[PDB]
Design a protein around this ligand. Structure first.
Ligand SMILES: [K+]
Ligand SMILES: [K+]
Ligand SMILES: [K+]
Ligand SMILES: [K+]
Ligand SMILES: [K+]
Ligand SMILES: [K+]
Ligand SMILES: [K+]
Ligand SMILES: [K+]
Ligand SMILES: [K+]
Ligand SMILES: [K+]
Ligand SMILES: [K+]
Ligand SMILES: [K+]
Ligand SMILES: [K+]
Ligand SMILES: [Mg+2]
Ligand SMILES: [Mg+2]
Length: 1327
RNA sequence: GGGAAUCCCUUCUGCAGCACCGUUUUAGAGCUAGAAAUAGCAAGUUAAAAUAAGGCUAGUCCGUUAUCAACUUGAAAAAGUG
DNA sequence: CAATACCTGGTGCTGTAGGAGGGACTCC
DNA sequence: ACCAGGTATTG
């Protein structure tokens, strides 16, 4: 018995089919287990497994790290209280106890209900004096009086609990605070550098202009408008824009060639400045430095909006300013509404449901919603002008704890904390002794390279300790081995050398590694001149001279430099032809030039004796990112360099690692030559072997040593998990393997001939970030003129409009937003060649005509017109490098014939790595024996197809698919994959190279474009029967095999199986609901009675459990027999599984039939009467469990009538005539749907509404009626009910809110294919 | 066909370290006329604590990913069954 | 019990290795 | 937004 397997691997489905020699699908009698009167069943060997999407680990990780941070914040507060313990016990022996129980109701409080002072008078007095904590913070910073220890604790604890971010290294307030002073010093530096062209900055209020609550460009324009002979794009204007955070281009200021685009926010600025300082000189370093200082001052003025000379707590002072202006404006606004619009005062200030002030303070109205609600009210009244100004500044009636407080750096809270400590250590000795301890509590962070401070019970931890003792913020440097931990952080993530698996890979920017790369590329260069008979390699001396003259004097070596600065200067060649390199060398000695600029000792870099040292330095610069640790490591070489050079070395850092180890590059030596790999790269006679040739040459010992150096096997699941790909497709892959195992077991452990596999093919925030970055880097204002919300960017044309800066991409013209529907979206490379519909291959233009010819890439004229605009869009990252290269390919010859042939080959031949991994897995599982030559015996051919093959097959032979009808199309795709792949390799066996796993352009283009014509009877004529040319074996009978495919697709019995899964994840909805009298509320803590404290509800059921027992009834507690479904929640699952009987008895059940406990996961299948099926959605809800096997004729009619996806106009007219001749299929389809719904769905109201809706639109165009009949199948689809629209009529979902019936129905346990069943009559349970 | 180093992009998987809000109960004396229901007015911006219940291994650790038909063994892991 | 209608934790930042899609270039 | 299961209100 010979057979093949077809597979369709998706993210939510694995379709499977078994075919025979004649492309038929077998059917078998399968034994049925259980307690029913059915002993066996007929099954077709075709089906599809369905499953919920596999989830990434991201949400779990975010929750885990948030858990850690909550624990550590609690620990900070605990450290502070431990410091305060004894003296607070002297002052108030229950203060911390009152703080701990602040959440409890007075009933459950063991102490007085007023936390700070324990009596109502003192508490009310405190609140009257300090309405916000920031009042107390400012007072404890400024005052000289001894203060109550409890208020000191409250201030310090508030600073420590909410300490602020750590984006800024070093200390703050370094006299970079005043904006006036830094603006004036910038003017000083500018006038020093440009004596002849000075700026009169007198009378310019730099403070108010630069610190204003406005956009960067607006403040730039404001400051420039106060400078007459100055424009915003001049040098001083560019410096001010740099200080404001924009992206100025200093090219035009200095008449440069290199585009000196500078942004202080980017990571490259430090080099971007230095690079710029190369051309203009070092005299301008002070200018850009003053600009950087001014930028710091403006950033601080964003947060501190108060004069810093009246208080040492400007942050708390700014919060108090918020409070005071809120109070004044609230009084004024209340008076306004009292006098003018009194009929609205109650709604504004009493209705929490409304987004007024009441809903803003007491309800759920945010600052934005409150502004939106009150802006028209302020506009409607008189005297609200300053209020509307404050509102449009987003600075009206502000709270202190707000979303934007994320700006506040931790150093400001630290300054306030340090000031309070300095004030109050004069009166409390323990504050003086523990000042730095508290400061350290605030400042200390666990470094990212250290990880969790575990002690052997964390699978995530890598930290190593110097000494075995409890880690605290104060003993961290002594207990934690930061060096070993930071090294393990990297070395656990980095690959070893694959050639030498025990050797660590070199740093990417290692000098030796770059030498290796440069020589490896330079060895394959060839050159010709006039007198030369044949192109020649570069000799060792030639390569060394090129390295010394060009690679060690320029960061990049171009081909022009090679021709002129070497072949002309040294070899005296006026003309030379170069091969092996184009435009410029890819490899370069970048680290060499970095270190040459830093240390300024070329002889030091060139001396081989220092090699090791330099390597180690680069290692330190690559392995570590903490500047203190880098300094500590470089300290061993302090004697070799000046302190200035040592500082500059500290600041330089590298990221990334190579692919080869030092021992491979320059360690192992060929036995006879005694030469390393790099030695051969530098000089190898006239053979000039590169790395690949060197390690594969049988006349050298490199290959032998590599084989010798090679060295536990993964499980199937482990191997699949370690694949690179989405976890969803990995779930699909493992399910595919299990399906194949079961199918082989079905066929009596006989392995198939072939296995044909095909693998299927927030974000608006990403788009808005893309466009913001591109426009601000571009310097455009299209966002000013056209505000847009991230959701709108999901329209393709508008997103393209913004990525193109509102311009045509083929014509140097502006485009109109309001006319986007009149424009075109065009593919850069035509979709007839590259089926690419991403934004990467798409372009918004006024007319696609202006592209040029439609058979190729945009013409040369358009490229010459628009290359500059495209390069600007590329530098703004609004288009990618690939998009730019495809747009500009016409200047490089456009599309060659080889390119089109390759595009069609790509359309047909699968090349994704993950599909190859699936093929390898199946192949290594199926083929395990070796022959006489010890070569693998490939009994099973693993073929991989792309979806376009079977899609075109369906569209060419009218085997159409409609995904909304049911789930049968996955199984049908698997069947068609099996058939098409088997026939394709039977017809052309040589194609086994391309399609089977294991080891002229016009001609190939023609061949691949017409590879599937042997199925056709006439082309653009061919025999009916199609055979193999050499074997003479028949591969396709066009008179009988298409009928076989049609009959297979018409079979109504298809094994659709929904994978039953225990639910995991969160216990319930995260919302912390207010108190409520309901047993649904769940306590957030053991003693927090939800009736008093609120809590959660809506828990997730891990799985239900069938319980057959007795429950007490009535006041008499009489035992009554019951059979019911109990949903074990995810939170209850461990307790239930530890002891099921005790768990159930705690719920109330008595005399539980232990052996009759059935574990029912989600989607458990039950059959009732008339084949009606239900799936377990929960313990108290059901899902639809049946498939609607709509006959093939109705499916094809619906495909054709709805214009689902053309062909010849004669064929189009024939299909149209078929539709119009079979219009009665509409009523027939509605009849099929109605019979199915009355038998199985059981939604009387929805079915009647649907019948009325269909009878209402019977005069509608056939296209529309068919398109909405497509929607109608949501009523009948398998799974959870959902709402659907028939035209404008909306049908809400009918839900099955009871599970009582399945307790007496037939439970069906299905194998992974559903061919093996166990049926349990549940009516025989309970009595 | 498969594979490797380098260059330019683009993207995704795993991990660690942090910040800001939100919510929840309590605290921040509401007043006056009424017996009351209620009416009129005042007021509001802040804090504490929790942020998966919790666990033992007690760490400044772990607690939401992956994996799961039934049945027979078997504590499990596992093998087997049509 | 049925029809119905609501509801559903969110944002921002730093560091890091690896695989893999597209295009070059040299090779096994 | 999604889905789609939990929940209270209504009857
Ligand atoms: K009490
Ligand atoms: K001006
Ligand atoms: K609010
Ligand atoms: K490693
Ligand atoms: K190049
Ligand atoms: K580094
Ligand atoms: K020195
Ligand atoms: K799971
Ligand atoms: K899930
Ligand atoms: K209150
Ligand atoms: K199953
Ligand atoms: K990442
Ligand atoms: K990457
Ligand atoms: Mg906790
Ligand atoms: Mg808060």
């Amino acid at each position: 018995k010979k057979y093949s397997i077809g597979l369709a691997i998706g993210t939510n489905s694995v379709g499977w089919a078994v075919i025979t020699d004649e492309y038929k699908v077998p059917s078998k009698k399968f034994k049925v287990l259980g307690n029913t009167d059915r002993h066996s069943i007929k099954k077709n060997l075709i089906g599809a497994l369905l499953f919920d999407s596999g989830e990434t680990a991201e949400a779990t990780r975010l929750k885990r790290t948030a858990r850690r941070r909550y624990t550590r914040r609690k620990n900070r507060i605990c450290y502070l209280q431990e410091i305060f313990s004894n003296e607070m016990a002297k002052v108030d022996d229950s203060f911390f106890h009152r703080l701990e129980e602040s959440f409890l109701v007075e009933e459950d409080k063991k102490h007085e209900r007023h936390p700070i002072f324990g009596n109502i008078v003192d508490e009310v007095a405190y609140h009257e004096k300090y309405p916000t904590i920031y009042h107390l913070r400012k007072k404890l910073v400024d005052s000289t009086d001894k203060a109550d220890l409890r208020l000191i604790y409250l201030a310090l604890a508030h600073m420590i609990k909410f300490r602020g971010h750590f984006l800024i290294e070093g200390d703050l307030n370094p006299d970079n605070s005043d904006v006036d002073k830094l603006f004036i010093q910038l003017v000083q530096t500018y006038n020093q550098l440009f004596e002849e062209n000075p700026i009169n900055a007198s009378g310019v209020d730099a403070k108010a202009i630069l610190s204003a609550r406005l956009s960067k460009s607006r403040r730039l324009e404001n400051l420039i408008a106060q400078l007459p002979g100055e424009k915003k794009n001049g040098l001083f204007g560019n410096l001010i824009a740099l200080s404001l955070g924009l992206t100025p281009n200093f090219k035009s200021n200095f008449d440069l060639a290199e585009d000196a685009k500078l942004q202080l926010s980017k990571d490259t600025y430090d080099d971007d400045l230095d690079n710029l300082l190369a051309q203009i000189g070092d005299q301008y370093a002070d200018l850009f430095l003053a600009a950087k200082n001014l930028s710091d001052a403006i950033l601080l003025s964003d947060i501190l909006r108060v004069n810093t000379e009246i208080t040492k707590a400007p942050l708390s002072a700014s919060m108090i300013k918020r409070y005071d202006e809120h109070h004044q404006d609230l009084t004024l606004l209340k008076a306004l509404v009292r006098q003018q619009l009194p009929e609205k005062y109650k709604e504004i200030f009493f209705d929490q449901s409304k987004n007024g002030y009441a809903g803003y303070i007491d309800g759920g109205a945010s600052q934005e919603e409150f502004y939106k609600f009150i802006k028209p009210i302020l506009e409607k009244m008189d005297g609200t002008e300053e209020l509307l100004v404050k509102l449009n500044r987003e600075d009206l009636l502000r709270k202190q704890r707000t979303f934007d407080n994320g700006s506040i750096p931790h150093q400001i809270h630290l300054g306030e904390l340090h000031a309070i400590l300095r004030r109050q250590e004069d009166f409390y000795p323990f504050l003086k002794d523990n000042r730095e301890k508290i400061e350290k509590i605030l400042t200390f962070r666990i470094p990212y390279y250290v990880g969790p401070l575990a002690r052997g019970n964390s699978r995530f931890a890598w930290m190593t300790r110097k000494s075995e003792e409890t880690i605290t913020p104060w003993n961290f440097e002594e207990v934690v081995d930061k060096g070993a931990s930071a090294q393990s952080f990297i070395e656990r993530m980095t690959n070893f050398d694959k050639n030498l698996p025990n050797e660590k890979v070199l740093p990417k920017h290692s000098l030796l590694y770059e030498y290796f790369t440069v020589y490896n590329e330079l060895t394959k260069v060839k050159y010709v001149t006039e007198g030369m008979r044949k192109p020649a390699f570069l000799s060792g001396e030639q390569k060394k001279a090129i390295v010394d003259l060009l690679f060690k004097t320029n960061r990049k070596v171009t081909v022009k430099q090679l021709k002129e600065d070497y072949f002309k200067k040294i070899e005296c060649f006026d003309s030379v032809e170069i091969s092996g390199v184009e435009d410029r060398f890819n490899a370069s000695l970048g680290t060499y030039h970095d270190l040459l600029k830093i240390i300024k000792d070329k002889d030091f870099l060139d001396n081989e004796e220092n090699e090791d040292i330099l390597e180690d330095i680069v290692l330190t610069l690559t392995l570590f990112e903490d500047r203190e640790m880098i300094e500590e490591r470089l300290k061993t070489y302090a004697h070799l360099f000046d302190d200035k050079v040592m500082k500059q070395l500290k600041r330089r850092r590298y990221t990334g690692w190579g692919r080869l180890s030092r021992k491979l590059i320059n360690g192992i030596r060929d036995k006879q030559s005694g030469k390393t790999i790099l030695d051969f790269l530098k000089s190898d006679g006239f053979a000039n072997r590169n790395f690949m040739q060197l390690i594969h040459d049988d006349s050298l010992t490199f290959k032998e040593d590599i084989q010798k150096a090679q060295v536990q096997g993964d499980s199937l699941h482990e191997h699949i998990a370690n694949l690179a790909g989405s976890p969803a497709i990995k779930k699909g892959i493992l399910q595919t393997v299990k399906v194949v195992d079961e199918l082989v077991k079905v066929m009596g452990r006989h392995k198939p001939e072939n296995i044909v596999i095909e693998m299927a093919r927030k974000n608006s925030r990403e788009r808005m970030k893309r466009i913001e970055e591109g426009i601000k880097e571009l310097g455009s204002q299209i966002l000013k003129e056209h505000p847009v919300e991230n959701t709108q960017l999901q329209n393709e044309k508008l997103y393209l409009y913004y990525l193109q800066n509102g311009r045509d991409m083929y014509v140097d013209q502006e485009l109109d937003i309001n006319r986007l529907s009149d424009y075109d979206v065009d593919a850069i490379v035509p979709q007839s060649f590259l089926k690419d519909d991403s934004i990467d291959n798409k372009v918004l233009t006024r007319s696609d005509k202006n592209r040029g010819k439609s058979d190729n890439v945009p013409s040369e004229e358009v490229v010459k017109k628009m290359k500059n605009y495209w390069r600007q869009l590329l530098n703004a990252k609004l288009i990618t490098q690939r998009k730019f290269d495809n747009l500009t390919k016409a200047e490089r010859g456009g599309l060659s014939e080889l390119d089109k042939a390759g595009f069609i080959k790509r359309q047909l031949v699968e090349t994704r790595q993950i599909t190859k991994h699936v093929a390898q897995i199946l192949d290594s599982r199926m083929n395990t024996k070796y022959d006489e030559n010890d070569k693998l015996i490939r009994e099973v051919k693993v073929i991989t197809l792309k979806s376009k093959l079977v899609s075109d097959f369906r569209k060419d032979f009218q085997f159409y698919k409609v995904r909304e009808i049911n789930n049968y199309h996955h199984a049908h795709d698997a069947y068609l994959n099996a058939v098409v792949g088997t026939a394709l390799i039977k017809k052309y066996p040589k194609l086994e190279s391309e399609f089977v796993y294991g080891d002229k352009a016009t001609a190939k283009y023609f061949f691949y474009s017409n590879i599937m014509n042997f199925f056709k009877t006439e082309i653009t004529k061919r025999p009916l029967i199609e055979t193999n040319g050499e074997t003479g074996e028949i591969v396709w009978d066009k008179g009988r095999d298409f009928a076989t495919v049609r009959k297979v697709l018409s079979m109504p019995q298809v094994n659709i199986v929904k994978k039953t899964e225990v639910q995991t994840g969160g216990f319930s909805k995260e919302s912390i609901l207010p108190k409520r009298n309901s047993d649904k509320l769940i306590a957030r803590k053991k003693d927090w009675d939800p009736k008093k404290y609120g809590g959660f509800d809506s828990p997730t059921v891990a799985y239900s459990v069938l319980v057959v027992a007795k429950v007490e009834k009535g006041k008499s507690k009489k035992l009554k027999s019951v059979k019911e479904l109990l949903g074990i929640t995810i939170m209850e699952r461990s307790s239930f599984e530890k002891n099921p009987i005790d768990f159930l008895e705690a719920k109330g059940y008595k005399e539980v039939k232990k052996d009759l406990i059935i574990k029912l996961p989600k989607y458990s299948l039950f059959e009732l009467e008339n084949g009606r099926k239900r799936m377990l959605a929960s313990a108290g809800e059901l899902q639809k469990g049946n498939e609607l096997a709509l006959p093939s004729k109705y499916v094809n009619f619906l495909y054709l009538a709805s214009h689902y996806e053309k062909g010849s106009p004669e064929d189009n007219e024939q299909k149209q005539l078929f539709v119009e001749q079979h219009k009665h299929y509409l009523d027939e389809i509605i009849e099929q749907i109605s019979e199915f719904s009355k038998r199985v769905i059981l939604a009387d109201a929805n079915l009647d509404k649907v019948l009325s809706a269909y009878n209402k639109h019977r005069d509608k165009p056939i296209r529309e009626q068919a398109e909405n009949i497509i929607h109608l199948f949501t009523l009948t689809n398998l799974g959870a009910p959902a709402a659907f629209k028939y035209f404008d009529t909306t049908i809400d979902r009918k839900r099955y809110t009871s599970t009582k019936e399945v307790l007496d129905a037939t439970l069906i346990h299905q194998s992974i294919t559903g061919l093996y069943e166990t049926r349990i009559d549940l009516s025989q349970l309970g009595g």
